[PDB]
């Protein structure tokens, strides 16, 4: 599935380091239903034009984007190039590439149990619980203190996002471990049939 | 601005002095691939993706042309503008948990980039690593600054300590984030 | 707009043509199709920046150069008796998508 | 990834109704075109289409795009004798700007 791009319009022609920056962005709610798409153009941090298909054509941010918003939408080809790119960007690539690529990428966590200081029964201590290298985001992570699950004492980070198509999140307990105590943690994520639970006998 | 899924297509970034070009895809905040303005290939992060989709090359060095010339006339058109350097925040974090004598990744977040262009190195004990050095491209933010991520292939030792050294025209002198395992 | 040289050249069997193509326009892309009854337009080469060229879909015994941005030429280094056909020369505007065509230039390879 | 016109040739008397088939295959979401060449000239455009149910026209020719059944039929409702001439379907791959044509069909519209 080819891949399909937003263009960008050319500008009308009319140390020090300048920065030039443009994209297309596309919002799809509840999947292709409804579909909102943004070009912006920036020139310095600062966003100077842009095209928004709720307001169907080019309109200047600033001053700097009047010459050009004028122009591209007065040129019939380009306004309505760029105006059916709802349809020839963001619905093509939702329904294609994606849909095949990232739409259907799902990696299983890998779990494990760990304990802050070393073990001495009948005294505080710290257990963690590190679910990692998952994918996509929706992740839900409980401990539970041999049979039931504690939701006090319990303290997560927050999503943590790798970079390279993973995340991870940490989930800690605190706790006080007594001989005959069974800790465990489950994790439930959308790449799983079934919810994954580590043990950690005290 | 409030959607299930976000793609953001054919990001162009240029910058001058030095015709500093990248071309980018990113889906839900993850680079789909990027496109090598020298080697005009596309290069997808997740390798399996290539398999099932591609993109032409061609593309990205097109939407280039663009957007270096668009430079040129927003420059003139206000007088040479210079941009304001910003002061770019590093976090040092491990990909899975640490665990001595066993290969793991350890990842540089730089946020609050800008302009993009940014040296990240690696120092071992403050030695200057080189080897097993990964980068991602400039991502994009809301407040149209940039993030890069760095990523250093390692063997979490007892008593080796890490530092991710940043050198942005943002700081006055290079901003060392240190990270150690115990 | 967009205008050809030469209007027709005849040419013998490994003998060698230019055809070189001027435009006006001001537009950056612009390509090299031929034409022949049973193929209708064919894509031989294109460039959209002044100094590459890229392949179509039959660059088989052609050659480009775009010296400049108005100035687009077809070189065939050795005439071929399968290369008689009609040759138009386009561009279009990097920010559009509608093609402008020159006359065309008849080419004809005798024995 | 192409385009396909059905016919090749077509003649008919003046003032008849002008219907001429056009179906493509394409890898992306392509803008579709029509393309007009009169004898001894360089084809030139005649309209275009975005996107699905969009319609093109002009001159009284028109088509609509029709992305279920991939097609782009030309139709005019009474042809005049000055519409005899060569008609392109086109198809404009946007990534990298390249348009493919159609094989074309001659119009002869006897006075």
């Known amino acids: 599935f080819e891949a399909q791009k937003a263009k960008a319009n050319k500008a009308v022609d009319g140390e020090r380091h300048f920065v030039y920056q443009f994209m297309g962005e596309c919002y799809f709610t509840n999947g292709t239903q409804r579909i909102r798409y943004v070009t912006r153009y920036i020139y310095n941090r600062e966003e100077y034009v842009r095209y928004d298909s709720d307001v169907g054509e080019h309109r200047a941010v600033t001053e700097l984007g009047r010459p050009d918003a004028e122009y591209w939408n007065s040129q019939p080809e380009i306004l309505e190039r760029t105006r059916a790119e709802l349809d020839t960007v963001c619905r093509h690539n939702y329904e294609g590439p994606e849909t095949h690529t990232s739409l259907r990428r799902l990696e299983q966590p890998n779990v494990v149990i760990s304990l802050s200081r070393t073990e001495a029964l009948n005294h505080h201590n710290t257990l963690v619980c590190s679910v990692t290298d998952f994918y996509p985001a929706k992740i839900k992570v409980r401990w539970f203190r041999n049979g039931q699950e504690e939701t006090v004492g319990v303290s997560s980070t927050q999503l943590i996002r790798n970079g390279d198509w993973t995340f991870q999140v940490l989930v800690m307990l605190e706790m006080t471990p007594r001989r005959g105590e069974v800790y465990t943690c489950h994790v439930e994520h959308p790449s799983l049939k079934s919810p994954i639970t580590v043990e950690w006998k005290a | 601005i409030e959607a299930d899924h976000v793609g953001t297509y054919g990001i162009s970034v240029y910058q001058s002095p030095g015709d500093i070009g990248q071309y980018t895809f990113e889906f839900d905040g993850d680079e789909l691939f990027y496109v090598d303005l020298d080697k005009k290939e596309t290069v997808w992060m997740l390798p399996e993706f290539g398999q099932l989709a591609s993109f032409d090359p061609q593309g990205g060095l097109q939407n280039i042309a663009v957007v270096k010339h668009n430079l040129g006339v927003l420059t003139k058109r206000s007088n040479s503008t210079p941009a304001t350097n910003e002061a770019p925040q590093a976090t040092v974090f491990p990909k899975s948990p640490v665990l001595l004598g066993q290969p793991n990744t350890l990842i540089c977040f730089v946020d609050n980039i800008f302009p993009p262009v940014i040296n990240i190195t690696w120092l071992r004990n403050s030695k200057s690593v080189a080897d097993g050095v990964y980068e991602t491209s400039f991502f994009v933010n809301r407040d149209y600054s940039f993030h890069k991520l760095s990523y250093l292939t390692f063997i979490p030792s007892d008593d080796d300590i890490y530092d991710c050294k940043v050198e942005h025209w943002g700081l006055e002198e290079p901003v060392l984030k240190h990270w150690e395992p115990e | 707009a967009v205008t050809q040289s030469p209007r027709s050249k005849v040419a013998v069997t490994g003998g060698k043509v230019t055809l070189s193509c001027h435009q006006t326009?001001?537009?950056?892309?612009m390509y090299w199709y031929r034409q022949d009854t049973g193929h209708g337009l064919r894509l031989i080469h294109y460039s959209y920046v002044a100094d590459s060229t890229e392949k179509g879909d039959i660059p088989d015994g052609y050659k480009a150069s775009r010296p400049s941005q108005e100035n687009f030429s077809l070189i065939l280094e050795l005439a071929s008796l399968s290369q008689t056909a009609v040759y138009f020369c386009?561009?279009?505007?990097?920010?559009?998508?509608?093609?402008?065509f020159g006359e065309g230039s008849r080419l004809i390879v005798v024995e | 990834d192409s385009v396909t016109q059905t016919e090749g040739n077509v003649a008919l008397s003046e003032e008849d109704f002008l219907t001429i088939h056009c179906n493509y295959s394409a890898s992306g979401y392509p803008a579709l075109f029509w393309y007009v060449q009169y004898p001894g000239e360089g084809p030139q455009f005649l309209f275009r289409?975005?996107?699905?149910?969009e319609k093109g026209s002009s001159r009284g020719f028109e088509a609509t795009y029709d992305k279920g059944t991939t097609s782009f039929h030309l139709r005019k409702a009474s042809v005049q004798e000055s519409d005899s001439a060569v008609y392109y379907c086109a198809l404009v791959i946007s990534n990298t700007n390249k348009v493919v044509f159609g094989t074309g069909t001659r119009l002869q519209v006897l006075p």
């Open positions: 326009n001001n537009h950056d892309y």
């Open positions: 386009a561009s279009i505007d990097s920010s559009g998508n509608t093609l402008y």
């Open positions: 289409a975005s996107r699905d149910k």
